[PDB]
Design an enzyme around this catalytic site. Sequence first.
Site, PDB file in Angstrom:
ATOM      1  N   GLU A 126       0.907  -1.174  -0.083  1.00 32.37           N
ATOM      2  CA  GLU A 126      -0.031  -0.028  -0.026  1.00 32.37           C
ATOM      3  C   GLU A 126       0.865   1.166   0.197  1.00 32.37           C
ATOM      4  OE1 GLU A 126      -2.865   0.085   2.878  1.00 32.37           O
ATOM      5  OE2 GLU A 126      -4.063  -1.686   2.207  1.00 32.37           O
TER       6      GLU A 126
ATOM      7  N   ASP B 143      -6.934  11.734   1.998  1.00 34.03           N
ATOM      8  CA  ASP B 143      -7.156  10.526   1.211  1.00 34.03           C
ATOM      9  C   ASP B 143      -8.329  10.640   0.024  1.00 34.03           C
ATOM     10  OD1 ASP B 143      -9.789  10.325   2.359  1.00 34.03           O
ATOM     11  OD2 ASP B 143      -9.827   8.522   3.442  1.00 34.03           O
TER      12      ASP B 143
ATOM     13  N   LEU C 292      -6.308   6.674   9.125  1.00 33.74           N
ATOM     14  CA  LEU C 292      -7.219   7.615   9.071  1.00 33.74           C
ATOM     15  C   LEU C 292      -7.245   8.531  10.330  1.00 33.74           C
ATOM     16  CD1 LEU C 292     -10.339   7.559   7.039  1.00 33.74           C
ATOM     17  CD2 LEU C 292     -10.470   8.722   9.136  1.00 33.74           C
TER      18      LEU C 292
ATOM     19  N   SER D  81     -12.089 -20.471  -1.054  1.00 35.11           N
ATOM     20  CA  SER D  81     -10.581 -20.161  -0.866  1.00 35.11           C
ATOM     21  C   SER D  81     -10.458 -20.714   0.363  1.00 35.11           C
ATOM     22  CB  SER D  81     -10.133 -19.166  -1.678  1.00 35.11           C
ATOM     23  OG  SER D  81     -10.260 -18.904  -2.929  1.00 35.11           O
TER      24      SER D  81
ATOM     25  N   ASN E 265      -8.016 -20.695  -6.699  1.00 35.16           N
ATOM     26  CA  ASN E 265      -9.244 -20.022  -6.392  1.00 35.16           C
ATOM     27  C   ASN E 265      -9.096 -18.499  -6.253  1.00 35.16           C
ATOM     28  OD1 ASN E 265     -10.130 -22.961  -5.222  1.00 35.16           O
ATOM     29  ND2 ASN E 265     -11.526 -22.238  -6.736  1.00 35.16           N
TER      30      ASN E 265
END
Length: 455
Positions: free
Chosen positions: A18, A27, A39, A124, A139
């Site tokens: 990220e 943001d 945040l 999954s 998957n």
Amino acid sequence: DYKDDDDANIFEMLRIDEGLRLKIYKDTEGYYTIGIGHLLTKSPSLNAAKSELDKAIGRNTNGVITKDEAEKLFNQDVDAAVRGILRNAKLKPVYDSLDAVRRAALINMVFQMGETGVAGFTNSLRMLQQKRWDEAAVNLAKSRWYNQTPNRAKRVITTFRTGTWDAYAASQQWTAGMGLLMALIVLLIVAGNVLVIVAIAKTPRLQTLTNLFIMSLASADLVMGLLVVPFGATIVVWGRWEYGSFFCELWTSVDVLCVTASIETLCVIALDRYLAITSPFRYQSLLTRARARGLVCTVWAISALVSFLPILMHWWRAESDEARRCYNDPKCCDFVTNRAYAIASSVVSFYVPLCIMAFVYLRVFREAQKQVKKIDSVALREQKALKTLGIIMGVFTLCWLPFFLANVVKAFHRELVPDRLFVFFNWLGYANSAFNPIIYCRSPDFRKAFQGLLC
Ligand SMILES: CC(C)CCC[C@@H](C)[C@H]1CC[C@H]2[C@@H]3CC=C4C[C@@H](O)CC[C@]4(C)[C@H]3CC[C@]12C
Ligand SMILES: CC(C)NC[C@H](O)COc1cccc2[nH]c3ccccc3c12
Ligand code: NA
């Protein structure tokens, strides 16, 4: 504490996935945010956000923080994800069965999608709690997640599959290794070609008619090092196009333009040296200094016509799932083309000039032997200058022929060329922009010309 290194490891995982910011920023929804997505507040006041930061950090940050303090925030966000996982009946049994590394993968998906988002991977999740890792990885890859962020998704999925951090180690040294190598390649291209232009431009001895063409060739190489290679390297390193759909097409157009101009300049050179040695009087009768400047503009004019026009007209576009999903994603700038364009474009822009430039220059290279059946030392002074033109034509064919043979093999049967391989052949051709200035030092006149300009 003995648990500290696990917090640093998951922090570095998301730092790669990220990114990290040490100064407060808004943001996309406009809320004040710092660190890795932490945040601070939904309040519009910036001072309320710095106030919330100073509370969590324990000092007056003024909205700036260190990496270690950003990790302090991130550990709190990780605790919130764990609480949400533990309260989700589909995720808690999987989380309980996983080790720290695979838990980090699951927590990473939760940061991207949320608990409910991860909770929808019902098959999954069954395979993970069942420790059927390779089937869980398959998957997981069949997802819009994988298609939208393939680099992060491959890393996370590799982490569930192997149970190691190897995908993140492989990434972090790829960004450093290739980031450095690409930097050196852009400089060696811009350095060697900027010198070749100034040397021919302000050395009277070098202002040969052939050097007028070589300045066109070096002028193509210099656009490669300024406007093409630097931006193609970001794709090799960052794994995605960052500059939008418009600059994607423009970059692609300039890329096709410079390659088309280069082989055409080499072909005009081979046709220049063929007229020069077969009909010397027509050569003196026809080629004025201004007409030679007209050939250059005609070559670039034909090149922009055969490059920009098809691309701006979208004549290249295909209808496949691979093509449409790239055309509709600004982050994708793969040059996915229809089989027809892959042939006609590479034939008009390359094979035809490659054959004329290779056929004509061989008949040139043999007539020189036909007119010099002798042993001589001064002949080496002229075999050398002729050999330089045959090296540049050869190195160009080596750097780019594999890219265009794969391009036609790719067209009939995509089965045969891995995208890893096709990208490597494309960078073999980018490397030609570096080689030429090195080859230009073979001749004595450029040699003393480069040596005087550098001091
Ligand atoms: C990057 C793209 C969009 C810009 C293209 C640059 C164009 C303008 C470049 C490409 C090659 C260049 C030519 C190559 C070298 C010469 C010979 C020189 O003695 C006079 C100018 C002239 C004829 C140049 C004019 C400008 C030129 C045509
Ligand atoms: C990253 C991609 C966009 N790079 C393009 C190549 O450097 C140069 O490609 C070409 C140059 C000249 C003619 C061409 N015809 C093509 C057909 C398919 C792909 C490339 C080309 C091509
Ligand atoms: Na695109």
